[PDB]
Structure 1
Amino acid sequence: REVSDQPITLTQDDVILVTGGTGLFGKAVEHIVKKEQIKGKWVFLGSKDGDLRDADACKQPFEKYRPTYVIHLAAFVNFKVSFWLDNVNMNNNILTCCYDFGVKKTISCLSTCVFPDKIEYPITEEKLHEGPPHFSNNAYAYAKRMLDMLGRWYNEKAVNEGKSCLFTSVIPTNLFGPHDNFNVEAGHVLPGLMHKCYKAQQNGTDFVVFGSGKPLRQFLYSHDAARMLLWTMFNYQSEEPIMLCVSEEDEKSIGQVAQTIKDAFNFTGNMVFDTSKADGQYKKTSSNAKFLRLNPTFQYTPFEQAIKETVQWFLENYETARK
């Protein structure tokens, strides 16, 4: 079945290798692991630790740390050629090292933006390969598609050779939280609005939002994503990707996001919407039905509570935050 009869129980002898562990998602995983006293030696790799696109450099952390579990979060996010080569080489290397070094379970990370361009909503995991992705990021998208397929192919090989190697994947939708990229120009909508509001509070200016503020998105707190990913590691046995998102009823509009940010900074000035900028797509809804059916009692952090925590982290660490 999709979930093991009993959860995997980590011990002090287990080693968990987390590629791309220094970003938004990795830092949340590290935060939950320490907070919940999850056992094992957790190794959070960054680029400083080695170029995973090179096959030889990629095995060095496997030879060094001898992992029993792998959480594969690294990606390259410039010519489309480079996005294809860099990502497909890294993914091919990591999964191959995971099989060769006898990793018990490997969990990789897909993305909402790799699904078919022509797709009927809500996006469900089963639609991943049902048509070409959008043209605009199709190199990144196809490399993610082939990360999923390579996992299924290594499962076939493991079954054939009697090896105990499991490959699966998760699909987070719009993460936000501490250790995000808060650049107003380059960063994601939610972290950038936090920085714009704070500058409006420090200065005398108005909080300006690009667009009408009406498009609705599903936003997942990074700490929640980490709890969902860890549950997946402990319990989820299927090779099918599992979507990690909030329900549709929990989708906030951009204006709601901006308003929540203002009231978390205790911002008193005016907040205006610049409708010169064209509005993005109105809704791009992902279904959390699978996670809801397999882990029905999961509790999310309410959006307002999550914004207060990120603003609070962002305020306490502004000097050291990525901007």
Structure 2
Amino acid sequence: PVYSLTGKKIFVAGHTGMVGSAILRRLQHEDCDIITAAHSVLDLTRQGPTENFISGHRPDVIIIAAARVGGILANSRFPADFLYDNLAIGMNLIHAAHQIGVERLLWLGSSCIYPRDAAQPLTEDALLTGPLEPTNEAYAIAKIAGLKYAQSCARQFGDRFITAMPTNLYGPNDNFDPTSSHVLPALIRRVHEARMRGAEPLREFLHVDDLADACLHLLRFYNGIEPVNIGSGEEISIKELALTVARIVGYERKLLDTSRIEALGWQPRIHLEDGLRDVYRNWLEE
């Protein structure tokens, strides 16, 4: 263990988010002091307020889960917002963290910022080796710049700042809106509206609580400079996924290379059928 969170002050940026809330849940078990700021009180694109919040509270650990995220329609129609919001968040937090000597910082990348035509399964060193996917290039460029700024701080100063590269997430606080772009929520939705109405390629899905566990694992064990993929491992086809979904509801080429996180002795512990059923019932009861 290169680093222990016990006794440390941990700022979880974006704690109302899907990923941020999972981190906060995993943390309240830990013996630490957790620090949060709602989006309503601290706009993390504002360099002034962000620095004063970091200089006043002085966290040992910053976990950056604050972000502007959305589907293909949002990214192509609001590219300036998707670039600026995410870049300014990362720049303001990384710079403030470097200035006061924050012991550990975690930035969140994304599986969709690798080159569009990079070889599958995606290794972390595929980053920047080719053209970006145009529809979310603005988001990708912001996430890439933040990752590289964290890397430059680790190189120049030895700041222990790392980036995790997740994959498609599901689980608690997912987006079940009818306009959600998340495949699995919409499938549970489309198959449920088909179940009670009585009508006639490979993918990867990672449970948010596994991702949260892996993030704390990287914080406790990972000191490298390069990013680390956090993948599912257990793949499934949209075909096989539909039959898994339909059996849940009673109806009648984008995968990460996880060699690196596996060498750290971490592997996701939630099975797809367990998480889906556990999420199918919460969507009913809510």
Q: Is the 8 A contact 1:22 1:44 kept in 2?
A: no
Q: Map Cα deviations across residues 251-280 of structure 1 (whole Å, 9 max, x no partner).
A: 111132232233334x2x43xxxxxxxxxx
Note closer, same or farther for the CA distance 1:30–1:206 as it changes in structure 2 (3 Å cut). Answer: farther
Say yes or no: does 1:99 pair with 2:68.
no
Distance 1:299 1:186 in 2: 25
Q: How many residues align?
A: 279
Compute the displacement of 1:132 (Å). Answer: 2.4
Compute the displacement of 1:194 (Å). Answer: 1.9
Q: Is the 8 A contact 1:184 1:196 kept in 2?
A: no
Say yes or no: does 1:292 pair with 2:284.
no
Q: Secondary structure at the match of 1:225?
A: helix
Distance 1:79 1:114 in 2: 17
Distance 1:24 1:80 in 2: 22
Q: What is the TM-score with the length of structure 1 in the denominator?
A: 0.81
Q: Map Cα deviations across residues 64-110 of structure 1 (whole Å, 9 max, x no partner).
A: 43211011112222432232222222211110011112210101100
Distance 2:68 2:88 in 1: 11
Residue type of the alignment partner of 1:301: I
Q: Which entry has the higher C-alpha Rg, 1 or 2? A: 1
The aligned counterpart of 1:240 is 226
Residue 16 (structure 1) aligned to one of 10, 18, 21: 10
Say yes or no: does 1:221 pair with 2:207.
yes
Residue type of the alignment partner of 2:272: F
Compute the displacement of 1:33 (Å). Answer: 2.3
Q: Is the 8 A contact 2:203 2:235 kept in 1?
A: yes
Q: What is the TM-score with the length of structure 2 in the denominator?
A: 0.90
Q: Map Cα deviations across residues 31-87 of structure 1 (whole Å, 9 max, x no partner).
A: 2223xx211112344422311111112124313432110111122224322322222
Q: Using the TM superposition, name which of 19-28 and 39-48 deviates more.
A: 39-48
Compute the displacement of 1:123 (Å). Answer: 0.7
Distance 1:60 1:187 in 2: 36
The aligned counterpart of 1:312 is 281
Compute the displacement of 1:204 (Å). Answer: 2.1
Compute the displacement of 1:299 (Å). Answer: 4.8
Q: RMSD value over aligned CA atoms?
A: 1.9
Q: Secondary structure at the match of 1:97?
A: helix
Q: Is the 8 A contact 2:44 2:50 kept in 1?
A: yes
Q: Secondary structure at the match of 1:108?
A: strand
Residue type of the alignment partner of 1:33: L
The aligned counterpart of 1:88 is 87
Q: Is the 8 A contact 1:9 1:234 kept in 2?
A: yes
Distance 1:310 1:45 in 2: 27
Q: Using the TM superposition, name which of 51-60 and 220-229 deviates more.
A: 51-60
Q: Secondary structure at the match of 1:238?
A: coil
Note the 1:33-182 alignment, pairs <5 A. Answer: 33-34=27-28, 37-77=29-69, 78-159=77-158, 165-182=159-176
Note closer, same or farther for the CA distance 1:16–1:206 as it changes in structure 2 (3 Å cut). Answer: farther
Identity across the alignment (%): 27
Q: Map Cα deviations across residues 104-159 of structure 1 (whole Å, 9 max, x no partner).
A: 01011001111112311211001112122111111111111111110111123324
Q: Unmatched 5+ residue regions in structure 1?
A: 1-5, 160-164, 208-214, 271-282, 319-323
Distance 2:258 2:118 in 1: 16
The aligned counterpart of 2:72 is none
Q: Secondary structure at the match of 2:197?
A: coil
Q: Using the TM superposition, name which of 141-150 and 85-94 deviates more.
A: 85-94
Distance 2:110 2:210 in 1: 16
Q: Map Cα deviations across residues 201-260 of structure 1 (whole Å, 9 max, x no partner).
A: 4x42438xxxxxxx211111111111111101111001111000022xx21111322322
